[PDB]
Amino acid sequence: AVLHINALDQLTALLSTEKVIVIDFFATWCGPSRSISPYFEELAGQYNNIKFVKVDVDQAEEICVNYKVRSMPTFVLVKDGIEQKRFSGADRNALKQMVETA
Amino acid sequence: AVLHINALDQLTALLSTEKVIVIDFFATWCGPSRSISPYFEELAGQYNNIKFVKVDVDQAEEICVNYKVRSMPTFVLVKDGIEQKRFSGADRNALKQMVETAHH
């Protein structure tokens, strides 16, 4: 399943204990394009070896501060505790690539 | 119960005529907009002394510009012709406060 985290220490602890995490900083509103959240959930169900985490930017101020989130959605790939890659935008291709190469 | 308005001069005339208005900027292609749309419409029945309006962002560019709406759903409270409050996102509780605290 998709994880739902809003507390920094819980995210930080996840990053310690799992190997590959893809974070989706999302909002309960859309901008220029439809939500990619169904595709994120679909990818979560295909790559059980990766932890897929959704972080509601309107509920996780501390994480958004720490991670320097400026726009939504922002997707961050983290391996072995360290950030590998991030992009912003509701872009199915970019998300697939990130997951593919995780 | 819920007025649908995509022209700027039409909205502005409404807002120059009615005392209290809550506007819902929506996109049918936006999941969270769909989710709360039902509740907005429910609330529109419930509170009869507030004019409830939907503006489709795909049909309402000039309105989206004057209002600086770039996200949906965005709800805006206008009272006595002045914008009082706004918020974006499908948060049913925020919408209730707004509707309740119209200061009526």
From TrEMBL, chain A:
Site residues (Contributes to redox potential value), renumbered to this chain: 31-32
**Similarity remark:** Belongs to the thioredoxin family.
Molecular functions (GO terms): protein-disulfide reductase activity
Organism in which the protein naturally occurs: Entamoeba histolytica (strain ATCC 30459 / HM-1:IMSS / ABRM)
- Segments forming domain Thioredoxin: 1-102
Which PANTHER family does UniProt cross-reference here?
THIOREDOXIN-LIKE PROTEIN 1
User: Which Pfam family is one of those matched by this entry?
Assistant: Thioredoxin
Where, by residue number, is the active site? Answer: 30, 33
Q: Which InterPro entries match?
A: Thioredoxin (IPR005746), Thioredoxin-like_sf (IPR036249), Thioredoxin_CS (IPR017937), Thioredoxin_domain (IPR013766)
Protein name, UniProt field: Thioredoxin
Gene3D superfamilies, sorted: Glutaredoxin
Question: Could you tell me which PROSITE patterns the record lists for this protein?
Answer: THIOREDOXIN_1, THIOREDOXIN_2
Site positions for Deprotonates C-terminal active site Cys: 24
